Design an enzyme around this catalytic site. Sequence first.
Site, mmCIF file in Angstrom:
data_model
loop_
_atom_site.group_PDB
_atom_site.id
_atom_site.type_symbol
_atom_site.label_atom_id
_atom_site.label_comp_id
_atom_site.label_asym_id
_atom_site.label_seq_id
_atom_site.Cartn_x
_atom_site.Cartn_y
_atom_site.Cartn_z
ATOM 1 N N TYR A 221 -11.028 5.154 2.266
ATOM 2 C CA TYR A 221 -12.194 4.633 2.982
ATOM 3 C C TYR A 221 -12.042 4.895 4.488
ATOM 4 O O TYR A 221 -10.989 5.337 4.946
ATOM 5 C CB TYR A 221 -12.380 3.129 2.700
ATOM 6 N N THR B 190 0.826 -1.192 0.000
ATOM 7 C CA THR B 190 0.000 0.000 0.000
ATOM 8 C C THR B 190 0.874 1.260 0.000
ATOM 9 O O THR B 190 2.094 1.173 -0.159
ATOM 10 C CB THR B 190 -0.958 -0.028 1.178
ATOM 11 N N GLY C 15 -4.260 13.194 -9.028
ATOM 12 C CA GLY C 15 -3.203 12.541 -8.266
ATOM 13 C C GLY C 15 -2.346 11.608 -9.095
ATOM 14 O O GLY C 15 -2.836 10.962 -10.023
ATOM 15 N N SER C 16 -1.065 11.516 -8.745
ATOM 16 C CA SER C 16 -0.067 10.872 -9.616
ATOM 17 C C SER C 16 0.604 9.631 -8.986
ATOM 18 O O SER C 16 1.776 9.312 -9.295
ATOM 19 C CB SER C 16 1.015 11.887 -10.022
ATOM 20 N N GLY C 17 -0.130 8.927 -8.121
ATOM 21 C CA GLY C 17 0.444 7.793 -7.394
ATOM 22 C C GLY C 17 0.317 6.451 -8.109
ATOM 23 O O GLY C 17 -0.362 6.336 -9.152
ATOM 24 N N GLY D 210 -13.906 4.121 -1.173
ATOM 25 C CA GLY D 210 -12.970 3.019 -1.364
ATOM 26 C C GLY D 210 -13.436 1.647 -0.928
ATOM 27 O O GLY D 210 -12.865 0.639 -1.350
ATOM 28 N N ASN E 51 0.511 -4.232 -6.002
ATOM 29 C CA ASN E 51 -0.065 -4.144 -4.662
ATOM 30 C C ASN E 51 -0.103 -5.501 -3.984
ATOM 31 O O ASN E 51 -0.568 -5.601 -2.888
ATOM 32 C CB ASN E 51 -1.476 -3.587 -4.718
ATOM 33 N N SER F 248 -1.533 4.224 -7.043
ATOM 34 C CA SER F 248 -2.936 3.855 -6.986
ATOM 35 C C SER F 248 -3.638 4.351 -8.245
ATOM 36 O O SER F 248 -4.575 3.717 -8.761
ATOM 37 C CB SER F 248 -3.597 4.439 -5.736
ATOM 38 N N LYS G 297 4.322 0.809 -3.550
ATOM 39 C CA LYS G 297 3.841 0.044 -4.701
ATOM 40 C C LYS G 297 4.817 -0.014 -5.877
ATOM 41 O O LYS G 297 4.965 -1.060 -6.517
ATOM 42 C CB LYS G 297 2.491 0.544 -5.165
HETATM 43 O O1 LIG Z 1 -5.768 -0.275 2.866
HETATM 44 C C1 LIG Z 1 -5.373 -1.362 2.412
HETATM 45 O O2 LIG Z 1 -5.171 -2.371 3.092
HETATM 46 C C2 LIG Z 1 -5.060 -1.456 0.944
HETATM 47 C C3 LIG Z 1 -5.290 -0.357 0.130
HETATM 48 C C4 LIG Z 1 -5.027 -0.377 -1.378
HETATM 49 O O3 LIG Z 1 -3.939 0.514 -1.670
HETATM 50 C C5 LIG Z 1 -4.734 -1.807 -1.883
HETATM 51 O O4 LIG Z 1 -4.144 -1.748 -3.189
HETATM 52 C C6 LIG Z 1 -3.835 -2.585 -0.926
HETATM 53 O O5 LIG Z 1 -3.607 -3.884 -1.445
HETATM 54 C C7 LIG Z 1 -4.535 -2.773 0.390
#
Ligand SMILES: O=C(O)C1=C[C@@H](O)[C@@H](O)[C@H](O)C1
Length: 260
Positions: A207, A65, A125-127, A227, A90, A129, A69
């Site tokens: 989230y 995360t 955003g440029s990550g 999320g 990930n 993710s 990554k």
């Molecule tokens: O909050 C988490 O546990 C995650 C968030 C994302 O970035 C996912 O890509 C990661 O595998 C798990």
Amino acid sequence: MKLKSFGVFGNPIKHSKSPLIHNACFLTFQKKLGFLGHYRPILLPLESHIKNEFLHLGLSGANVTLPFKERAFQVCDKIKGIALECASINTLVLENDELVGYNTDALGFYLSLKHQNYQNALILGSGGSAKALACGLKKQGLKVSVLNRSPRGLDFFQRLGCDCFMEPPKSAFDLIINATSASLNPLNKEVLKGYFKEAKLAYDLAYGFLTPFLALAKELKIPFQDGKDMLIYQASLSFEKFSASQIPYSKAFEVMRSVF
Ligand SMILES: O=C(O)C1=C[C@@H](O)[C@@H](O)[C@H](O)C1
């Protein structure tokens, strides 16, 4: 019975709900798996190597995360699926004493929906993710516009051939996003305000609580989403892999949905 260890690598990491949903699965499916899986949050020094440490702790698998990554992509021994064209993974797996990388944010974010009606989108955003998102939407054939006042390695979306901005496009979009090392606590309320109107769906990777971002967002009587649903989809997909493919993603996805 065998204890197989797993974890989510990150920093910060304490708010991740990955342990909750993966442990629901390990317990649910141990009869089919033939070992006891235990998943735990791992807070990583920023200076450390995921590789050296994945073997130090003898993990069998792990998620990655913020912010490891792309660092992660580098130290694999093999990389599979859409990851090859993502420069970020990930998900990790020890297969045959070989470390293998995957990326599930891609498909994950995609399955996050649900009805295949859309034509374009705009990624704040440029990550890592966002990298996987973009790359994921391209494949699903979309007109993808990225926007970040950051620049370095914004070539990636360039090299990938989507439209890059440091100023909101005088355009109108079906999806806006956000994938920022900010949000803790985006782009100025106005440049934001104007774009948000007549958008088809809002959507925040993050989230847990309601972000400044979405907090507002909804307020404007908009269709929205956070999320949660993605977290689950991408986890169920990583689990499938952890299960060396014995457990299908969608079965995992049911178990996971029903705790969180
Ligand atoms: O909050 C988490 O546990 C995650 C968030 C994302 O970035 C996912 O890509 C990661 O595998 C798990």
